[PDB]
Design a protein around this ligand. Structure first.
Ligand SMILES: Cc1ncc(Cc2csc(CCOP(=O)(O)OP(=O)(O)O)c2C)c(N)n1
Ligand SMILES: Cc1ncc(Cc2csc(CCOP(=O)(O)OP(=O)(O)O)c2C)c(N)n1
Ligand SMILES: Cc1ncc(Cc2csc(CCOP(=O)(O)OP(=O)(O)O)c2C)c(N)n1
Ligand SMILES: O=C(O)C(=O)CCCc1ccccc1
Ligand SMILES: O=C(O)C(=O)CCCc1ccccc1
Ligand SMILES: O=C(O)C(=O)CCCc1ccccc1
Ligand SMILES: O=C(O)C(=O)CCCc1ccccc1
Ligand SMILES: O=C(O)C(=O)CCCc1ccccc1
Ligand SMILES: O=C(O)C(=O)CCCc1ccccc1
Ligand SMILES: [Mg+2]
Ligand SMILES: [Mg+2]
Ligand SMILES: [Mg+2]
Lengths: 533, 535, 533
């Protein structure tokens, strides 16, 4: 039994948990989008600009701890997604990039083809720098094995992969795609590693379990919550890891942000003699903000299929394998006070400050509203989100690339089964990708978006306030919402903010944009310290 | 300031280099002129480039320092790729210095003799067989580049490549300073040593297995001391034959699995504390099976790393680990050598040669360092008493033997070298002996002549191509300035060896006629083991 | 119908004209040598050291204008042939390098394998720098096509190629090797090129046809002799091209060597307004010796499948295609005096000088002896050979790598069908590879070798006479000849030289080594000028 290549790929993706395919077509990709649309194997969602295709697919992958799918056309499409994919690579999100391409017999007539780079292979070379595996599906006989190998790499390494499909191969007959190639694990090495880790955590006086991205990438949040419970150790997330263990009976104590975070959490972390960095990205965003210099060599670090502690490394140790191995050595368990969330918004005629937004959101939850998953862009919106009650959070906490927010909220809500997403984004970032909200009506989603409008690239002003180029105009985003099919309202007072948030939650059917005017110079408590240090 | 070429020679001497082996060519004449005129390093010329590399390799192994091989562009350098690949494989810091076109040559629309596809082709090839490279085409950066490159050769103990454009030889530069420092984390080192020491003390039958890095980094005395303080026996790998030759308590023997002494093999393979010190994990050192060694259960220190208990400590120099272990330790039945050569009218077998050599040592002769080529000559040397031994026990490239013996004796301050080599290998590089007179050396060379590539016959006896002609090597010795004698009986063998040892001034070639089909038991069992492995 | 891979390769080589296979085995190459020996598809000739395997195969390829074959083992064998292959690449000789290698399943047991470089692929990477095409025959299904592609490249480009054969693939079943892939030629471009070339040669007042290596590499000597005849133009060879058109009714006028060659030939060449460089290597050895600077841009240059003239280039123009195209535009023809050969040896008690050797050889030919093909090493032996009457000549006239001589003479005589080869070589070069003569008895050849013994690397002394490292000992090569199965005689007087040469020609059955003692400082007329300028 054979099937068409494109159909075999779509089915292989669905078999691996992909829930949708985001994309923007082009002539080279038309045959492929046709198969996607007509077969309906994966729900096809189009967007306006490719960066959003990349971010939405990344968000979908983060939301479901599975493969995200982003389909584009040759050159103009793919090169326009390099930044979003570089970001997914950095934050370990398995985005499957599928690009259309000239057919295997094209480009031999002495003519250059629209969308090609210096050579026809230039695009492939560029994507090799931002993906962990690649394949040009130009040989039907090899396609099934290549798809399995590439998709297998994305799942094992939890990073983007690249598939280039010559258009004349879309309907080529192939055999069904088999299973991912297996990645061997030495059981004796895993046993030794787990034994050493457990002994180190057990000998520490003040052990701390610090969770980061891989914990959700490999679907280990529940097991890790159980591990901490069994070890009797507190859990704190890294900055990038904000949003992890949101459903654990015992939530993490808080998020470590060094001099910019809660003093007690910072103290617990930096003075720990048993700091277990579980699935952590060793980024400046997660650790350069330390008050006391943190000797990374004295921590236990599990990441990228390896575990390092005691100045040595155990290679080929999958995080899931380690977590299971530790749980197997721990009997079931037969507590520090968590960092308090800002609450008590004063809904009066006073101006809006970032913390007021955090209080407004937290107050509704405390009043009975089930928290919403939060999608944050990079800016003070993210540093503010750090003080918000969430049902998970996705943000570019390491790559720090702006534009992520609105498209991520869109991608997440496309696969959320009816659950609304709360998006926080600044005016700078909204000018980049907030416009994608114009697609909500067709996609059938109604995210609530809180836009922090300080008519400025404020994070940059804070870094270098003397400069004038960080000044932005006052765009009337709420006024422009209607043009995009959503409900927009500009709020200037804390009372208007509270009222706005209430109506947005009471109004489904279309995206709700709450444009919160914030004076320049007014920051979140977290961001101030992050720079004031 | 000083001339770039002189600055490099002084930098080499500063690091212990003792000589410069080489063959000139037009692109290298200016460099060879500086070397000859400054006399910073004695300049020894040979006949063919493979020998230049082998000799430089041997000198480096002999003094645990840098070896120096100078050649000309293309025809010189490419002809040394094999010797350098072998030095890389066997961790010998050979500094390859090649002449090259001047920085302003090759721009008149003409291809230059000796160039590869492009002028940079040679450089690209050498990147594959060296750990560091530099084209000294900028006087201002030359001192620092020389320091970086020579520093890498010392730290990694592997060959490096220096390409010197002709017009830069006499360019003015500042003196060369010290090697860049390779930082070592003291906390990591302490933890590494603590784990290793604990593992060795926990074992009921610990074994110290020494290999090349032990000599490369000048650690033989310290390792011998280490074995004594730990109270553990020392055995060498096949490649490591010759190590700890003058230790108060020499190694018990050399591990060769099914091909070596059964007691040594049992000790190694049954050990629950096998410490592979500076060991190359090659098929030659370990595939000689018997009982599969789980390498993951050993302690392996090699290439500036230490692996045990399924994990690795990076950036841990072997020397640092040995010193760290000694700092944690308070001060605190050898395999017999075959003897009794029967000086009679029977034919000569490989073992008879080992008995002849060993009998002399037991009679009072201080052992000589042995230089061996690849062939049954090496497997036979495993049973000889030596004052050290150098052989291509891993790379296994033929031609190493004679040139290595020559290179070693050039830097041995008077000590004579014994070389063992087969007829096949001698046909490749034995001719370099014609350089002995000019070099002022007189090595003793025992040529195993069976008119055959016998090791290959053993692997595939049905083939006719392993049958070689009978070359009269002893008869050709005079033409090269040496004394040769062909021997066929054990009695002639004994007489020739005594005569050779009692005759200085000219190399002594003893051509021992060994019958085809006659091979050392070690080689026979080695090959039989290999055949079953790949069955 | 299928056959074993090794057998298919050997047959593919024979189908392309290969006449023998030179090699030295090793364990990784044993299975392959077994097939070669037992099938006898290609006569198998072994040598002592790999450099000779490379040189002999190169010489065989030059001798028959076909593929040469050199078989070695992994690492120790192959890396030992890099220099000879670099030389074949430089002088455009299609040497097929076949190396044994570990089987496809070896090297996965945690152990390094004897003969490997840094990695198992290190050797392959190195050979890519000195060959025009490569293939590891590790896939039976692809092997036939890969062999055809690689062998096809060697023949089209006339340069070495590399084939790596994992030992477990030697007897793998494969389909027979098909034809070489075709290399397209634009007929309109060839027509335009030929028309322009013909017009330029026709408009020149003093046109000259200068032949070089490609003329024999592509078997065009006879057609090129006819072309010169039809154009009515004199032919001169480049230095590298010495030996070309040896059988043409009208031999070339001589060999161009600038200030070091004949003044009249140098004048004709450098003052030519129609200099056609046919198949020429633009090397310093061929043109840096010019008295008057030669503006290469004003010549017509056909080489590497292209033709350049009038400041422009015609790509993809095969030399054979151009020669045929020119002949097609020239009607059959319905003469300058050649450079005279040195003759009249005075066979007395005087000492030997290089020119005396040239006179001795030339005198026997003039007296009735059919000239012999000459194999020359690099040294004054080559500069002397420039004045010898030959039936072709092979020498490293561009790469200039020593060691070429004896092995080249050996390789050539192995495929010469009984014709003896005359080899000229210096003491320096003989110390490197002259020992290969010990194989003559088993190979069944009896070359005549004239060894120029000046106990010195004289060419280098001439370049820098103040140095002492160019001094060599006096090796008794004639005395060592017997040990190698040949007849050696040392000659010191011109009378002994003449006598020696006569006996050597009268003695077949074993190689004849005539060791001619030459005082240091005594050079060929050609070499002196080559430096004295
Ligand atoms: C794609 C990209 N281009 C530029 C930048 C550099 C940047 C980091 S933060 C910032 C200003 C963001 O202004 P915004 O109004 O969105 O939020 P806020 O600072 O709180 O006022 C910029 C331009 C990044 N990170 N990504
Ligand atoms: C440069 C190179 N080319 C080929 C080979 C392959 C080989 C390994 S063993 C052997 C035969 C050696 O014959 P020899 O007479 O020297 O000693 P013996 O076997 O005891 O009779 C060959 C050709 C190697 N290792 N290196
Ligand atoms: C493989 C290689 N290594 C070094 C060199 C450099 C060289 C070019 S010419 C020469 C001296 C040759 O002495 P020979 O006795 O053979 O003939 P003659 O000069 O007339 O006395 C050398 C060393 C080359 N070209 N190739
Ligand atoms: O579809 C796309 O991606 C395009 O940009 C269309 C560009 C127009 C176009 C140019 C050349 C051939 C076919 C179409
Ligand atoms: O990957 C990120 O963006 C993070 O902040 C880690 C938490 C991700 C996340 C948690 C819960 C639901 C969806 C996503
Ligand atoms: O010295 C060497 O290495 C040689 O090969 C000499 C080749 C002769 C030579 C050719 C072109 C320029 C200069 C010299
Ligand atoms: O490197 C080799 O070839 C070995 O066999 C290891 C021992 C080397 C060696 C020991 C003693 C003196 C000189 C050299
Ligand atoms: O045959 C060759 O090329 C050799 O060098 C033989 C080296 C000895 C050898 C080592 C490891 C496995 C099998 C044999
Ligand atoms: O390729 C070379 O070495 C040359 O000198 C060109 C002539 C080659 C050559 C001519 C005649 C018979 C055999 C070979
Ligand atoms: Mg802003
Ligand atoms: Mg032999
Ligand atoms: Mg000479």
């Amino acid at each position: 039994s054979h099937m068409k290549l494109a159909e075999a790929l779509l089915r292989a993706l669905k078999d691996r948990g992909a829930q949708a395919m985001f994309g923007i077509p082009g002539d080279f990709a038309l045959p492929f989008f046709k198969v996607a649309e007509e077969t309906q194997i994966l729900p096809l969602h189009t967007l306006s600009h490719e960066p959003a295709v990349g971010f939405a697919a990344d968000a979908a992958a983060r939301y479901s701890s599975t493969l995200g799918v982003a389909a584009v056309t040759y050159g103009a499409g793919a090169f326009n997604m390099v930044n979003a994919v570089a970001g997914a690579y950095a934050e370990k999100s398995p985005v499957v990039v599928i690009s259309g391409a000239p057919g295997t017999t094209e480009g031999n007539a002495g003519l250059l083809l629209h969308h090609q780079g210096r050579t026809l292979d230039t695009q492939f070379q560029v994507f090799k720098e931002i993906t962990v595996a690649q394949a040009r599906l130009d040989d039907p006989a090899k396609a099934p094995a290549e798809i399995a190998r590439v998709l297998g790499a994305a799942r094992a390494q939890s990073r983007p992969v690249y598939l280039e499909i010559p258009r004349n191969m879309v309907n080529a007959e192939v055999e069904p795609v088999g299973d991912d190639p297996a990645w061997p694990v030495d059981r004796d090495a895993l046993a030794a590693c787990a034994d050493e880790v457990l002994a180190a955590m057990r000998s520490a006086t003040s052990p701390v379990l610090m969770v980061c991205v891989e914990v959700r990438r490999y679907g280990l949040e529940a097991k890790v919550a159980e591990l901490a419970q069994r070890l009797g150790v507190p859990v704190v997330t890294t900055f990038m890891g904000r949003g992890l263990l949101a459903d654990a009976p015992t939530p993490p104590l808080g998020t470590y942000i060094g001099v910019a975070g809660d003093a007690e959490i910072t103290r617990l972390v930096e003075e720990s003699d048993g700091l277990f960095l579980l699935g952590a990205i060793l980024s400046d965003t997660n650790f350069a903000v330390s008050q006391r210099k943190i000797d990374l060599r004295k921590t236990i670090h599990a990441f990228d299929r390896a575990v390092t502690l005691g100045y040595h490394t155990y290679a080929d140790i999958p995080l899931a394998g380690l977590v299971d191995a530790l749980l197997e050595r721990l009997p079931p368990s037969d507590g520090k006070e968590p960092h308090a969330y800002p609450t008590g918004l004063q809904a009066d005629g006073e101006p809006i400050a970032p913390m007021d937004i955090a209080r407004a959101v937290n107050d509704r939850v405390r009043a009975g509203q089930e928290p919403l998953l939060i999608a944050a862009d990079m800016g003070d919106c993210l540093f503010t989100a750090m003080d918000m009650i969430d049902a998970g959070l996705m943000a570019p906490g390491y790559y720090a690339g702006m534009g992520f927010g609105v498209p991520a909220g869109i991608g997440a809500q496309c696969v959320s089964g009816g659950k609304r997403i709360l998006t926080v984004v600044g005016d700078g970032a909204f000018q980049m990708t907030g416009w994608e909200l114009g697609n909500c009506r067709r996609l059938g989603i109604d995210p609530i978006v809180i836009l922090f409008n300080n008519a400025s690239w404020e994070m940059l002003r804070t870094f270098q306030p003397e400069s004038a180029f960080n000044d932005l105009d006052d765009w009337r985003f709420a006024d422009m919402a209607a043009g995009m099919g959503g409900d927009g309202v500009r709020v200037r007072t804390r009372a208007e903010l509270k009222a706005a948030l209430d109506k947005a939650f009471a109004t489904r059917g279309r995206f709700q944009l709450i444009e919160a005017m914030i004076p320049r110079g007014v920051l979140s408590d977290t961001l101030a310290r992050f720079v004031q240090g």
